[PDB]
Design an enzyme around this catalytic site. Sequence first.
Site, mmCIF file in Angstrom:
data_model
loop_
_atom_site.group_PDB
_atom_site.id
_atom_site.type_symbol
_atom_site.label_atom_id
_atom_site.label_comp_id
_atom_site.label_asym_id
_atom_site.label_seq_id
_atom_site.Cartn_x
_atom_site.Cartn_y
_atom_site.Cartn_z
ATOM 1 N N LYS A 44 0.800 -1.148 0.183
ATOM 2 C CA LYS A 44 -0.034 -0.120 0.077
ATOM 3 C C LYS A 44 0.997 1.108 0.041
ATOM 4 O O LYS A 44 0.126 2.359 -0.216
ATOM 5 C CB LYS A 44 -1.191 -0.055 1.032
ATOM 6 C CG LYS A 44 -1.895 -1.311 1.161
ATOM 7 C CD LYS A 44 -2.676 -1.445 -0.285
ATOM 8 C CE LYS A 44 -3.900 -0.603 -0.172
ATOM 9 N NZ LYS A 44 -4.831 -0.774 -1.303
ATOM 10 N N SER A 266 -3.156 -12.251 4.760
ATOM 11 C CA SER A 266 -3.809 -12.028 3.518
ATOM 12 C C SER A 266 -2.673 -12.698 2.396
ATOM 13 O O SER A 266 -3.115 -13.203 1.395
ATOM 14 C CB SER A 266 -3.804 -10.638 3.143
ATOM 15 O OG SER A 266 -2.649 -9.990 2.617
HETATM 16 C C1 LIG Z 1 -2.285 -6.689 3.949
HETATM 17 C C2 LIG Z 1 -3.090 -6.572 3.076
HETATM 18 N N1 LIG Z 1 -3.267 -7.438 2.036
HETATM 19 C C3 LIG Z 1 -4.158 -7.411 0.766
HETATM 20 C C4 LIG Z 1 -4.805 -6.274 0.573
HETATM 21 C C5 LIG Z 1 -5.789 -5.937 -0.729
HETATM 22 O O1 LIG Z 1 -4.817 -4.975 -1.502
HETATM 23 P P1 LIG Z 1 -5.706 -4.197 -2.710
HETATM 24 O O2 LIG Z 1 -6.399 -2.834 -2.358
HETATM 25 O O3 LIG Z 1 -4.704 -3.599 -3.663
HETATM 26 O O4 LIG Z 1 -6.631 -5.048 -3.473
HETATM 27 C C6 LIG Z 1 -4.279 -4.877 1.482
HETATM 28 C C7 LIG Z 1 -5.400 -3.911 1.062
HETATM 29 N N2 LIG Z 1 -5.197 -2.704 2.140
HETATM 30 C C8 LIG Z 1 -5.985 -1.806 2.373
HETATM 31 C C9 LIG Z 1 -7.227 -1.854 1.751
HETATM 32 C C10 LIG Z 1 -5.823 -0.805 3.562
HETATM 33 O O5 LIG Z 1 -4.536 -0.871 4.376
HETATM 34 O O6 LIG Z 1 -6.732 0.011 3.877
HETATM 35 C C11 LIG Z 1 -3.760 -5.160 2.525
HETATM 36 O O7 LIG Z 1 -3.653 -4.207 3.665
#
Ligand SMILES: Cc1ncc(COP(=O)(O)O)c(CNC(C)C(=O)O)c1O
Lengths: 306, 306
Positions: A44, A266
């Site tokens: 991110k 994740s």
């Molecule tokens: C640890 C983690 N894995 C997977 C994802 C999914 O990524 P995409 O937004 O590119 O699909 C996120 C998303 N984060 C978010 C949404 C946040 O931290 O607010 C995440 O923080």
Amino acid sequence: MSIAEDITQLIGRTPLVRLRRVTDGAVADIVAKLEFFNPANSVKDRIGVAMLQAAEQAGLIKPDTIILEPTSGNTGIALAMVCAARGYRCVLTMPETMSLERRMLLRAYGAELILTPGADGMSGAIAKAEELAKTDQRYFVPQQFENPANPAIHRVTTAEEVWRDTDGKVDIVVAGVGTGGTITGVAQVIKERKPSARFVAVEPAASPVLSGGQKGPHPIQGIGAGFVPPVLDQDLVDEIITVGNEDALNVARRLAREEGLLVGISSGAATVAALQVARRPENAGKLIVVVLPDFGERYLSTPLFA
Amino acid sequence: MSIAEDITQLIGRTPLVRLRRVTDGAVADIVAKLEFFNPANSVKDRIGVAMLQAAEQAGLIKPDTIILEPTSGNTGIALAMVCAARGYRCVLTMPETMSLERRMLLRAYGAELILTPGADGMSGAIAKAEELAKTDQRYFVPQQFENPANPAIHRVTTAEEVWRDTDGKVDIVVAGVGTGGTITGVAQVIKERKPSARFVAVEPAASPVLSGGQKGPHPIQGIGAGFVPPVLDQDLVDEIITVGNEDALNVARRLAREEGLLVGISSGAATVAALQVARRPENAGKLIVVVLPDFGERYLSTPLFA
Ligand SMILES: Cc1ncc(COP(=O)(O)O)c(CNC(C)C(=O)O)c1O
Ligand SMILES: Cc1ncc(COP(=O)(O)O)c(CNC(C)C(=O)O)c1O
């Protein structure tokens, strides 16, 4: 002279690594893209810089501007970090179910945090931000779930990194979906370039909204937001896989213990899916890229480690 | 095709970043080398791989070998990680004063941990390892404080990274000293190449053993071991600076909040020293490289964050 002017020039350019032990029954090759090689250890960081650069270039940031963003943690950490370097005031709304490490990091970067109810999850973190936005004109809400700069940075960086690094040989990309910016940006570039490429979205079994089920509480922080994000292009996704909590956790643990890859929940979930896909006879000898979003150190307070 | 075979091919090659705000009174240019861009987020990943590769290449690892190492945390995390990827059994002795995040990470990588008394610090972590070594022939003790592979990897990687990246323009290198492998390896290459280059060792004011004082307890984890490590070459060090606990902490905090660099306590300490050196009129327009060993997320349980 290779010296970054600031921390925002240090995002991206993350390494691919071949999985060797966590490959049970695989007939395809699986390589993980390691996003904790970012300046605040998550994918991110890419959008945190990108969304603010977009705002700056469109003249949306004023001297009294307060950045306000709904997050499950990592985007919030990314924005807090960019705001530290820039000198901006930054406020985050985030559900109270997210790891306590996310709360502490936000504060450490000098950002401010507002916790939203855990029963309302990401939808309620969004509402509180949209609700605060209209109380005061000083707020600027990037809104990662809607912001074009989110999938755009992934086209310009993530997609090209995957293409160059696999030398165009990539066949399938597996990725958890929060905002869906990662998978969408990568598919946008790679699928046009190589129309045979296939794209697998990963979501919690416990909250299978993309698969057409109803939303629900789950520990897979970062993904399974509980709605279909505007930023995701479902026409580019070729398959959805749902992953159970226990599998996601177990595989996260095996990656640490068998690969030396200490990654968040994740990333376990994305790998469960990447492994499932890699067992299909029709994928023998193909090259699969699984995106591993963050580092497991952010999760010590969670049941990933207990 | 740029894909690492395993996690050990992913060490090093860390970025330099210019400091912009945390530069009060500076007349020299200060750039930080960011070692949390390593696969387990610390400089020590370098020696964790290197010390085991050296052992393997000398045929010192047997099928029943148990790796045993005294650590204040980061080398232990580095070895635990390399052992996960390799399939080795790994045991660490570590003082009970070290961050609880170090304990949890060790376990998460499937390593085993033995806590030593906090009043005895690093000296007592060493003793317990040397004491366990002689109970069983299966133990192999890398011994970072004595191992030639420790400063060697720094010659081969850290030093060249600093030289190439500053295009030979580096004038001074500031670095906290635990084993002294980092500063020694870098000085060994750079000082021969550029004899005008100068090297500043950093140690706790509260435990100023290199400055000729007596050892003592301090929060600056990673440095101030309480003795002169065999691996350090004091003939290459040009100056020692001692840093107080409060300064180390404050600057660590300002780096997070002003630069977007969330770094551990020892990085605050190195930067206090780098700033002090950069205020000297005789250093106007010189290029200073401060080594920032690790990420601040490892320190949430410490007073760095409270
Ligand atoms: C640890 C983690 N894995 C997977 C994802 C999914 O990524 P995409 O937004 O590119 O699909 C996120 C998303 N984060 C978010 C949404 C946040 O931290 O607010 C995440 O923080
Ligand atoms: C956070 C941190 N900073 C600074 C240092 C000093 O690095 P040198 O050994 O290259 O001087 C260390 C050393 N680590 C040790 C010793 C460990 O984790 O056991 C460290 O962990």
